[PDB]
Amino acid sequence: HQAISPRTLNAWVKVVEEKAFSPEVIPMFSALSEGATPQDLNTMLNTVGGHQAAMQMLKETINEEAAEWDRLHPVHAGPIAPGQMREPRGSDIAGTTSTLQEQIGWMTHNPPIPVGEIYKRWIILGLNKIVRMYSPTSILDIRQGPKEPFRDYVDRFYKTLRAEQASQEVKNWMTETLLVQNANPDCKTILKALGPGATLEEMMTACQGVGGPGHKARVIAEAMSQVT
Amino acid sequence: HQAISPRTLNAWVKVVEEKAFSPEVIPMFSALSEGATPQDLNTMLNTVGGHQAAMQMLKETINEEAAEWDRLHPVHAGPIAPGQMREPRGSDIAGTTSTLQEQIGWMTHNPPIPVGEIYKRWIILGLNKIVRMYSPTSILDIRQGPKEPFRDYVDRFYKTLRAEQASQEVKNWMTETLLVQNANPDCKTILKALGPGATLEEMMTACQGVGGPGHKARVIAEAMSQVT
Amino acid sequence: HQAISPRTLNAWVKVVEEKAFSPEVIPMFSALSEGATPQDLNTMLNTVGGHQAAMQMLKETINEEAAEWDRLHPVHAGPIAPGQMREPRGSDIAGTTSTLQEQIGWMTHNPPIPVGEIYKRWIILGLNKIVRMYSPTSILDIRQGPKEPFRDYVDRFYKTLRAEQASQEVKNWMTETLLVQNANPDCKTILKALGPGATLEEMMTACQGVGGPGHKARVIAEAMSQVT
Amino acid sequence: HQAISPRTLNAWVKVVEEKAFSPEVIPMFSALSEGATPQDLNTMLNTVGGHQAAMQMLKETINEEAAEWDRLHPVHAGPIAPGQMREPRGSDIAGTTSTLQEQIGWMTHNPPIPVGEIYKRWIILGLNKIVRMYSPTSILDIRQGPKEPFRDYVDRFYKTLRAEQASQEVKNWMTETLLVQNANPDCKTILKALGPGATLEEMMTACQGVGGPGHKARVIAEAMSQVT
Amino acid sequence: HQAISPRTLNAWVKVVEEKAFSPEVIPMFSALSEGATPQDLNTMLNTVGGHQAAMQMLKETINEEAAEWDRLHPVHAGPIAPGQMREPRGSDIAGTTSTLQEQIGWMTHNPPIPVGEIYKRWIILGLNKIVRMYSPTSILDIRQGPKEPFRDYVDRFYKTLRAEQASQEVKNWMTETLLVQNANPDCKTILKALGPGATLEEMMTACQGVGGPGHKARVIAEAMSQVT
């Protein structure tokens, strides 16, 4: 059997990477996995890194479809040793508890039991659910909360940046601009007054005081001074 | 015995979606599932998407009814091979651990054991409890709390909108005319002062400082300014 | 056979400790464990002190690779006693459920079954993920939050210092010149006004009021006095 | 013989894309290709996309090493023998003109001819040459020349951006910022004269006059007026 | 064994012409070519006119995939009397050197060698590459450079219009409304000063002298007089 190829698998991973779960993922998945055995589909589903929530939702959808297939299709009374083989099971359709030889026998035995397209349909339903009910996160979406200390915001920003797929110089550029840009006015005013060319430690030291009694007293007194 | 038809099942899903478990769901369910086997009723109950809490309550009601049936009806002394078949069980009545062939045999064997009507009665009791003690959520119900960051409210609003059943243009209009409308006066004042035709990022940035050391000082100073 | 030596293992531990999980860790691990059996690799990994999160990530990666190997490679139909031995398994590749004699036989039986290099590849993938997606903690990173009580910050600082790898005199110097330095301005002002040569007790008992009604009233009154 | 797994190959592609032929690829390549077939090494080298100059340099180095191997190692008559194995040729170590069966035979028949290790050495030399010489091209490196039309600069910027590995939102943000931030002083000042949020077509229409006789006369007249 | 219907081919041409190479071509191409013999796929790829660069990238992708298939799959020198069908090669899958009868036999063999799906996967990979890295050139993108003579720009615009896909009246309207609009301010000023509704030859004569010595001196004098 013609198993999956490294080029096609890597192209599938790349198209998942560039477009996180845009509606263009389903046509590419349906095009790159024609005739693929459930083992190959599981390989393409496991190879993609990141998007843990989307993968969890897809696995939940696959489990639901397997359970429904189990409910609808019962178990045969007795196996036939000569010229017969075990009927497919929902987990076997999902490829969890089945071997590649058994899947090949299913796809070859006449009349065909096309487990491949059934598993592909389940995965496509999961992908549709992901497309409808999932929004990917990005470094652009990391903004400091109204009452979030600067250190925790910076930690979240750097965690997202590390998880983000970009070149090192691009990541450094984002660190240079977005981190200062995405901040509440309380921290942004202090950062602007700090001046350009200030390292991370200086900014952390400067914004360590936001939300404390001293900063609150200072801003309140400044507000009364401006009003009167 | 023929199974359920796709048209009737799709109409059931549509009526559940439109009435949102209104008191009119019970008549439609009783009308569309006349003579339905427990497998058909299980498909009827599982096909409807959304309303996770209501489905959970229905499942708890079914489990309680099955447990009560198990308690009231004991286990027979022993099976009889010639001209007899296994007596029903609460899980088997609910169709979880029974095959369609066994259910058909139960409905056919004289005197007719009414598995379908018993399961329908249990599901109807569950639906009654759902109607009495459940209120569906909608995008209209999503309002920002008195002390909530604008980002968290926006995230909840968009999650509800994604879960909401509406056309894309309707969803866009709801986003345009509801996000600003449903907000605390502190955020709504800033949004109104922003001016018509503002992007989501601009509004999010403008309301980042709400409920912060700088904002709470400015509003208090303005308050004493107005008073004195 | 020629098992691991105390010198190589100690050098591996030392380089891991001194460089943290830097990108330079992967080359050294690829040089100090040439031909190492999976038990030797497990000994190399286990002796790493600290870095619990990194070791957990490495173990998760190893488990994922073992599961994928189990999925891809099926179970043989029947064992053969004369001139044969059990085929490797993902857990056996990881060395969890295998003996040293079995691994040596695997590496010796012709054609060779490279259990050692497969396990090394899995560990290297885990190390790469650690390098990409992990930031080691240090005493320099311990700073007190804007609303954190001084006692809690001191406790965290001393816990990190105890976990830190340094000589006793250097640790004492770190305590002397870092605890006061890394604090919010509210506590730093009090500590500076305290004067040099004050032990931990006076510093802790002089910063017990930060965040209390008395301090939040005194600083506010001072702010109004300065403004007006 | 064990083949290259899709997971390790995808990880190799990912690390090559991430580090962008930094020194860190040199260890990792040797880490993931232990005992790898020269066909597996060829797949590893072919799968990585982009960096055409780097791959050309690597192929040139491989061809040079193959030519040197051909020069140093002479041909032989190769009579029919019980081993009936032909001596390898530089192309065979390169993997271009060698099938997998004879390749495993070379790696297995006593004495073992390590075609895989020789090909790994050649690829390592090529990678070292790439690290020393080749420099990656980034979107930040795109800067409009002193006398370059704005349309050509925009075309080059978008051509480089479409090959950049980043999320779509990140690419849109790059288009928003870097396109105007990197410009000729005349083009930059004309764009700054335009209000923010202008569309790309408007910006190109405004900059179409840069470098023409009218623009030259205008700037000369303004300079003469300013100085005198 | 049936060929592709002319209506399907015409619809494929229409869909590939209407939306250029927007991602939506990838799904449609999958649907119209399901079960298609590689000769039919070659006909579909050859019939579509325009976008020569896209066709070049496509053909490069099929060539690369065929080369990889050739490398991975070796050649069997000795023919086999039972099932006397030659194993498909890299060019055989693409249909360049394979006849219709051989492809039909390959898709009807036992076991089936699916040349059609492999070829379609190659074209789909090429189409994804086109979508990522190709921007179609339209008449709206034809703008005359700052130093471009008007005759050369007119020739380029007319070449693009002749290559444009639109009705003759639409072409005339685009010529009338776009030639004057898309020009540098230096020539657009002269064209606007010329009487509206002028012949192409008159416009070319009027703006032929732009960028020359006399025009440069005239604009220099005008600017210096306006300044003073």
Side-chain angles (χ1 to χ4, degrees), chain E residues 64-182:
Chain E
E64 288 183 10
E65 294 309 323
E68 285 270 302
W69 175 276
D70 273 308
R71 177 172 65 78
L72 289 201
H73 293 52
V75 155
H76 291 333
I80 38 172
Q84 195 121 61
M85 206 154 296
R86 28 175 293 198
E87 254 62 28
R89 294 301 320 180
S91 42
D92 291 32
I93 307 266
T96 299
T97 181
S98 73
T99 87
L100 180 49
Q101 304 225 60
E102 311 157 310
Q103 287 148 245
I104 271 175
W106 281 325
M107 270 158 298
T108 50
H109 205 11
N110 247 358
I113 301 106
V115 295
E117 339 170 313
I118 300 168
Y119 196 22
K120 195 200 308 154
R121 213 181 305 128
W122 295 349
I123 296 114
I124 275 144
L125 292 173
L127 285 157
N128 192 46
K129 172 165 327 300
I130 298 193
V131 163
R132 189 141 33 77
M133 298 275 309
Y134 164 100
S135 76
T137 67
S138 95
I139 198 138
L140 309 188
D141 278 4
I142 296 309
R143 338 199 69 112
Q144 163 203 30
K147 304 262 201 143
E148 202 175 350
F150 195 71
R151 265 186 172 173
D152 293 339
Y153 162 62
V154 152
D155 224 332
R156 213 153 41 89
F157 189 88
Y158 268 31
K159 184 154 82 42
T160 312
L161 179 123
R162 227 194 94 169
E164 190 42 303
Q165 203 84 70
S167 96
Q168 163 73 92
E169 309 108 15
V170 172
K171 277 182 188 170
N172 278 54
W173 176 71
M174 281 175 328
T175 278
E176 216 67 81
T177 199
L178 274 178
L179 203 72
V180 187
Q181 195 231 332
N182 277 343

Side-chain angles (χ1 to χ4, degrees), chain C:
Chain C
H1 78 320
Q2 181 257 305
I4 210 88
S5 80
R7 326 218 73 250
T8 58
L9 201 173
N10 273 102
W12 158 248
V13 173
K14 284 222 181 73
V15 62
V16 166
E17 283 328 323
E18 64 200 62
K19 310 188 153 163
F21 277 96
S22 211
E24 300 141 48
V25 174
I26 308 118
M28 291 285 328
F29 183 85
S30 201
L32 294 182
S33 49
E34 179 149 57
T37 55
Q39 153 184 320
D40 294 303
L41 296 151
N42 270 333
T43 314
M44 291 205 48
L45 283 182
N46 284 348
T47 56
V48 173
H51 302 315
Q52 253 317 341
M55 301 315 298
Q56 183 56 223
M57 271 185 288
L58 214 170
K59 205 67 49 173
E60 294 176 0
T61 316
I62 293 194
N63 274 347
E64 291 190 356
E65 301 296 339
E68 277 267 319
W69 173 279
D70 271 318
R71 179 174 67 74
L72 285 211
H73 293 262
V75 166
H76 198 270
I80 310 298
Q84 212 88 297
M85 72 149 96
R86 172 175 53 123
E87 262 181 314
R89 174 141 311 291
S91 67
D92 297 21
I93 297 300
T96 298
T97 88
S98 56
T99 87
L100 184 129
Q101 183 54 220
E102 263 172 340
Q103 297 166 0
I104 287 290
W106 280 332
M107 311 215 188
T108 286
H109 177 321
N110 228 345
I113 300 96
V115 184
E117 336 170 306
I118 296 166
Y119 194 22
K120 204 187 317 164
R121 194 155 60 231
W122 298 354
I123 299 167
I124 277 150
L125 291 173
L127 284 164
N128 193 28
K129 185 209 288 313
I130 292 166
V131 164
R132 184 151 41 61
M133 248 328 305
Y134 164 100
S135 193
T137 188
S138 81
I139 180 64
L140 269 309
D141 295 356
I142 297 302
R143 323 178 80 96
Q144 153 181 333
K147 287 175 176 311
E148 201 176 0
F150 196 76
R151 155 69 78 122
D152 293 301
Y153 158 62
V154 152
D155 281 335
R156 271 176 46 243
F157 186 98
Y158 274 94
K159 176 182 212 63
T160 302
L161 191 71
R162 269 193 275 283
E164 181 86 60
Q165 170 221 8
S167 36
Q168 202 39 55
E169 322 80 338
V170 177
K171 279 190 187 178
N172 297 356
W173 177 62
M174 284 193 222
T175 289
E176 262 174 3
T177 193
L178 271 186
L179 198 78
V180 191
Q181 151 155 328
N182 293 352
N184 46 339
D186 296 302
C187 292
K188 275 189 65 169
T189 293
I190 293 171
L191 291 197
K192 291 325 177 174
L194 221 57
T199 166
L200 190 72
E201 159 192 34
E202 301 148 292
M203 286 177 344
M204 257 157 63
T205 201
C207 291
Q208 239 188 331
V210 287
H215 190 215
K216 294 208 306 181
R218 188 178 73 236
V219 295
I220 280 180
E222 271 165 31
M224 321 305 178
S225 62
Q226 293 174 20
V227 143
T228 318

Side-chain angles (χ1 to χ4, degrees), chain A residues 27-75:
Chain A
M28 291 305 308
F29 185 86
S30 180
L32 293 183
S33 50
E34 193 167 320
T37 62
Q39 183 176 301
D40 306 1
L41 298 145
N42 269 331
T43 306
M44 327 173 33
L45 271 183
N46 295 346
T47 304
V48 39
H51 305 313
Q52 273 312 338
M55 282 305 129
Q56 193 37 32
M57 277 172 357
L58 213 178
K59 204 62 51 173
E60 266 157 48
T61 310
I62 292 192
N63 274 347
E64 288 183 0
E65 296 290 335
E68 288 269 300
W69 174 280
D70 262 326
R71 175 169 66 75
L72 290 203
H73 294 261
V75 192

